[PDB]
Ligand binder design. Structure first.
Ligand SMILES: *[C@@H]1O[C@H](CO)[C@@H](O[C@@H]2O[C@H](CO)[C@@H](O)[C@H](O)[C@H]2NC(C)=O)[C@H](O)[C@H]1NC(C)=O
Ligand SMILES: *[C@@H]1O[C@H](CO)[C@@H](O[C@@H]2O[C@H](CO)[C@@H](O)[C@H](O)[C@H]2NC(C)=O)[C@H](O)[C@H]1NC(C)=O
Ligand SMILES: *[C@@H]1O[C@H](CO)[C@@H](O[C@@H]2O[C@H](CO)[C@@H](O)[C@H](O)[C@H]2NC(C)=O)[C@H](O)[C@H]1NC(C)=O
Ligand SMILES: *[C@@H]1O[C@H](CO)[C@@H](O[C@@H]2O[C@H](CO)[C@@H](O)[C@H](O)[C@H]2NC(C)=O)[C@H](O)[C@H]1NC(C)=O
Ligand SMILES: *[C@@H]1O[C@H](CO)[C@@H](O[C@@H]2O[C@H](CO)[C@@H](O)[C@H](O)[C@H]2NC(C)=O)[C@H](O)[C@H]1NC(C)=O
Ligand SMILES: *[C@@H]1O[C@H](CO)[C@@H](O)[C@H](O)[C@H]1NC(C)=O
Lengths: 40, 234, 273, 49, 324
């Protein structure tokens, strides 16, 4: 109980990092689009 | 309407179709030729991707000689460097060659050598290319080789794979007791202990991105910059 | 019981017949050199590109529609700041995937072309993954087996999967001791699923009264070479199995056995075996 | 030389003697051997090749 | 009267930690309300090539330390835990003089009188049972093989050619704009053309003034398409030639009878499991492969198998369950 019992192209796991990086790029691109519209 | 002398840019842009606008084709013959050229470009791109796939399916590295019946061993005129190979004289190796290929003995007769240490010095200094010898003794020499340079072709896979024995006279009564002692020495880990002790083991067995292809494309791109500089200065 | 009860209790001399090797039989008697290399396997019934659900599986399709709605909202915002891309932005975003659409005039606000380039790079890497999946389709050519071996997740509990199964060995033999020396839980799931006869277990595998049976691999290959119907191809050849040999067991201290080993080492190196 | 889909590999192993399978003791053990020996020295395999 | 307790650094059993200030042990708390009752042990720092001489009092705790505390709770005695110099179990090693087979490590320190009791998961075999007496076997633990069951798009892929293509299209756009300056939203139109040639999917643009720049544009178009075609082709063919076949499944595999540089398997140097594998005479080739990569400690084996330097490792089962 002290040590032994005490534990701690599918596009779900392979492209999950693809999904996170593409989502971050989309958020950054939308932020740059709003900065470009608010500037000019 | 610029297809008089500028047809090279239009045609080699329609080779790749990288969204390069040129003009609005009103002629039917031009659209038919562009459609046939686009179908040819699609099947050429398919053949190019199939060529790259077939090149990647080919393995990383092969040996220089991958067989006893190699075309190098038939005649060294097939390849541009004339190689060389020798065996040990006054032994059973040359007889086992002559029991299989006396022509191999004929090609070896012009490529003779003196001794095992002399062939070792010839392999170190570069006076010999290949040397036919036993399997495990060359493995012992490769394990003590400083730098892991001299490595055999594999580990003795496509060879005869014979064995060693103790020769006695025909009719020896001690032969049965010697066979008893040897088969006792095998099946108790004692021979395994001796093969662990008296064999060295420093040199082991067989110690998306590319480098040279886009480098050559960079050389052709530098030539393209040179051609663009020539067309820019005139 | 049997030959071990005859040799250890000194009623017989040896066992020329087949006899497995484990710890306690190495303790009570002494085995010879392995004259044969055998293995075990599992015989099952194993009786006899339509549609792909690999890239999206009707879950990422919602995210495609969300990105279409976002690009349409940004196009409406640019048109308010500034030309059919108010409600027809779905066709303009999903129509530039397959690079033969009519070129629609983009606005000069440096907004549409950047996200078209980003969606085009996403389409290029998606076509790369699509051609990669079509090329990796060449790797498989047959359907995989139901039981890959002893390392299957079905052997934990068949309630985890939808079909339940069953498996048995010989009653009170060396196979059960080889199981209990490796897995007591396998013996627990096998005790309720026992059987009586090996040929009866084969008839039960044919008629569907048994799902799996553990037996020797080479004898099952011999029986599949003579099988009527030829519907039994053995899964593996000892990869996830025991794969032990057989020897000749004499009493501890027999002087003949060494000489018998000589005959064994005469029977191998001449093609006689 | 008949068709164009054949490659002979370089493996020339077990260079045996293709001759005539003969019987037991017989007076045609020597005379047939002398006829074959006469066939060796002249162009008898060469013209048949 | 004074028992010199010797042990080996086992990772789930003997946790060794350096002291806080001077010879003290931090009374840490577990999740079940049990305070960590450490003992002041005396241990070395590294191996003989590692450290010349560095032996300090540190804190030992864990499984076997609590077992020794339970043994001292049952039977009344005094003890002090000291560590072994090396990190090996002990083999029947041939010494030079007089051709004698000797034992080292914990057995070499116990039989020489330097120790009083070995506290370790001792493997019971023929050689060690005929020399000293044993106790009741408390642990029943089998062997297993630790393996690595594990699409290089941008982030798992190395960062050379991405920044190279970015700087390349930057330099191409700059020199096309400079040629648009020196003709034989102009910059925004040049950026639109440069990112539309690379777009490769369709855009509603035109054709800039390229009387001496159409060659650079067509070569850049073919250059971008041949880069993305080679990248798509070798990623697809790489993940095709990526083999899912990785499992070994125990001692029985005909592929390991003739191994290669891919099927990597080894064990801990001078371990009793290696002695048991050397004892069986049908395990010659696998012993010759495991002796190629003999590892000193288990942490080096964990670091090698985590960094994809290994493919298979022989180790006890419950310790690897704890590591999982
Ligand atoms: C290998 O054995 C042969 C004899 O079968 C040796 O060849 C000759 O041996 C005689 C007597 O020793 C010498 O007088 C000749 O000079 C030798 N001729 C040559 C050049 O071979 C031969 O010396 C032996 N040594 C080798 C090369 O292994
Ligand atoms: C399992 O072992 C037991 C012995 O422990 C065997 O049980 C015997 O089975 C026969 C069947 O006719 C009965 O007549 C005996 O009375 C049983 N003996 C008992 C009660 O111990 C059984 O045969 C073994 N399994 C096998 C070999 O099939
Ligand atoms: C077969 O070989 C033998 C030995 O060379 C020869 O035999 C001669 O045969 C003729 C037949 O009339 C006899 O007259 C001679 O006396 C034989 N001579 C000898 C040497 O024995 C001859 O070459 C062949 N003929 C046969 C069939 O005997
Ligand atoms: C703890 O130590 C004490 C001694 O201080 C032990 O008490 C004596 O043990 C001896 C052992 O032979 C007995 O003969 C005596 O009967 C004990 N003392 C008396 C006078 O009763 C005690 O046994 C030890 N406890 C343990 C668990 O070993
Ligand atoms: C044991 O003794 C030998 C000398 O008998 C020491 O030296 C080694 O000797 C062998 C040949 O017998 C050489 O192959 C080694 O290269 C030698 N070792 C060296 C100097 O690197 C050996 O060092 C001694 N080993 C121990 C355990 O002390
Ligand atoms: C010794 O141990 C300390 C930690 O207590 C460590 O920082 C150091 O690198 C080790 N080496 C030596 C001999 O100083």
């Amino acid at each position: 109980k002290t040590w032994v019992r005490y534990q701690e192209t599918l596009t779900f796991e392979n492209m999950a990092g693809v999904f996170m990086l593409v989502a971050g790029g989309i958020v950054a691109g939308i932020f740059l689009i709003f900065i470009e519209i608010a500037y000019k | 309407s610029f297809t008089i002398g500028k047809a090279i840019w239009l045609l080699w842009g329609l080779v790749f179709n990288n969204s390069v606008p040129v003009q609005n084709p009103k002629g039917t013959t031009s659209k038919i030729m562009v459609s046939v050229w686009a179908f040819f470009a699609v099947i050429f791109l398919a053949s190019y991707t199939a060529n790259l796939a077939a090149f990647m399916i080919q393995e990383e590295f092969v040996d220089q000689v991958t067989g006893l019946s190699d075309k190098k061993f038939q005649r060294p005129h097939d390849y541009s460097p004339p190689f060389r190979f020798g065996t040990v004289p006054n032994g059973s190796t040359e007889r086992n060659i002559r029991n299989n290929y006396p022509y191999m003995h004929q090609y070896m007769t012009r490529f003779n050598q003196r001794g095992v240490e002399d062939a070792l010095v010839s392999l170190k200094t570069g006076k010999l290319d290949a040397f036919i010898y036993d399997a495990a003794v060359l493995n012992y020499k490769a394990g003590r080789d400083e730098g892991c340079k001299l490595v055999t072709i594999g580990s003795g896979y496509i060879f005869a794979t014979t064995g060693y024995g103790i020769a006695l006279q025909k009719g020896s009564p001690w032969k049965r007791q010697i066979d008893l002692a040897l088969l006792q020495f095998v099946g108790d880990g004692e021979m395994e202990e001796l093969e662990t002790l008296w064999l060295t083991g420093i040199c082991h067995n067989e110690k998306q991105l590319d480098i040279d292809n886009m480098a050559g494309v960079f050389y052709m791109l530098a030539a393209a910059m040179a051609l663009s500089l020539i067309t820019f200065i005139w | 019981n049997g030959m071990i009860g005859e040799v250890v209790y000194q009623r017989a001399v040896m066992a020329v017949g087949s006899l497995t090797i484990n710890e306690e039989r190495s303790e009570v008697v002494d085995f010879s050199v392995p004259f044969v290399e055998t293995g075990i396997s599992v015989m099952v019934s194993r009786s006899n590109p339509s549609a792909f659900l690999e890239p999206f599986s009707a879950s990422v399709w919602v995210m495609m529609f969300v990105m279409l709605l976002i690009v349409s909202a940004i196009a409406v915002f640019v048109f308010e700041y500034f030309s059919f891309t108010i409600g027809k932005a779905i066709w303009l975003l999903w129509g530039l995937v397959f690079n033969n659409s009519v070129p629609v005039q983009n606005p000069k606000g440096t907004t549409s072309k950047i996200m078209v380039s980003v969606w085009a790079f996403f389409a290029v890497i998606f076509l790369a993954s699509y051609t990669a999946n079509l090329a990796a389709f060449m790797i498989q050519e047959e359907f995989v087996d139901q039981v890959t071996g002893l390392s299957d997740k079905k052997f934990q509990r068949p309630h985890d999967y939808s079909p339940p199964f069953r498996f048995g060995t010989v009653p009170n033999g060396s196979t059960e001791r080889n199981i209990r020396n490796n897995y007591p839980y396998m013996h627990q799931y096998m005790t309720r699923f026992n059987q009586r006869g090996v040929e009866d277990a084969l008839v039960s595998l044919k008629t569907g009264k048994l799902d799996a049976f553990i037996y020797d691999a080479a004898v099952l290959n011999y029986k599949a070479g003579r099988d009527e119907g030829c519907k039994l191809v053995t899964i593996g050849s000892g990869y996830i199995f025991a794969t032990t040999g057989y020897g000749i067991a004499l009493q501890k201290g027999s002087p003949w056995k060494r000489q018998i080993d000589l005959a064994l080492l005469q029977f191998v190196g001449d093609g006689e075996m | 030389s008949q068709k164009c889909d054949l490659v002979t590999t370089g493996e020339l192993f077990f260079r045996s003697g293709f001759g005539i399978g003969m019987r037991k003791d017989s007076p045609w053990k020597q005379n047939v051997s002398l006829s074959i020996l006469k066939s060796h020295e002249n162009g008898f395999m060469e013209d048949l090749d | 009267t004074r028992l010199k307790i010797v042990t080996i650094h086992q990772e789930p059993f003997v946790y060794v930690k350096p002291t806080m200030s001077d010879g003290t042990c931090k009374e840490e708390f577990t999740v079940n309300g049990d305070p960590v009752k450490k003992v002041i042990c005396t241990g070395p720092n590294d191996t003989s090539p590692g450290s010349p001489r560095h032996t300090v009092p540190q804190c030992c705790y864990g499984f076997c330390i609590d077992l020794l505390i339970k043994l001292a709770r049952t039977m009344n005695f005094t003890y002090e835990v000291h560590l072994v110099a090396d990190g090996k179990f002990g083999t029947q090693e041939r010494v030079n003089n007089s051709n004698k087979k000797e034992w080292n490590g914990m057995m070499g320190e116990l039989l020489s009188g330097q120790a009083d009791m070995i506290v370790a998961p001792l493997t019971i075999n023929n050689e060690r049972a005929q020399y000293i007496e044993f106790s009741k076997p408390f642990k029943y633990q089998g062997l297993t093989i630790l393996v690595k069951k594990e699409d290089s798009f941008m982030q798992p892929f190395q960062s050379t050619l991405w920044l190279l293509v970015g700087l390349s299209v930057h330099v191409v756009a700059v020199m096309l704009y400079l040629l648009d300056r020196f003709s034989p939203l102009t910059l925004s139109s040049a950026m639109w053309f440069s990112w539309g040639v690379l777009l490769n999917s369709g855009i509603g643009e035109g054709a800039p003034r390229s009387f001496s720049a159409r060659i650079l544009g067509m070569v850049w178009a073919g250059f971008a398409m041949i880069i993305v075609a080679s990248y798509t082709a070798n990623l697809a063919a790489f993940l095709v030639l990526d083999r899912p076949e990785e499992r070994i499944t125990g001692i029985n595999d005909p592929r390991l009878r003739n191994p290669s540089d891919k099927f990597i398997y080894a064990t801990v140097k001078q371990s009793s499991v290696d002695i048991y594998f050397r004892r069986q005479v049908e395990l010659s080739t696998m012993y010759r492969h495991m002796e190629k990569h003999n590892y000193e400690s288990a942490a080096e084996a964990i670091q090698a198998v985590r960094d994809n330097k290994l493919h298979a490792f022989i180790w006890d089962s419950a310790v690897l369950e704890f590591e999982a």
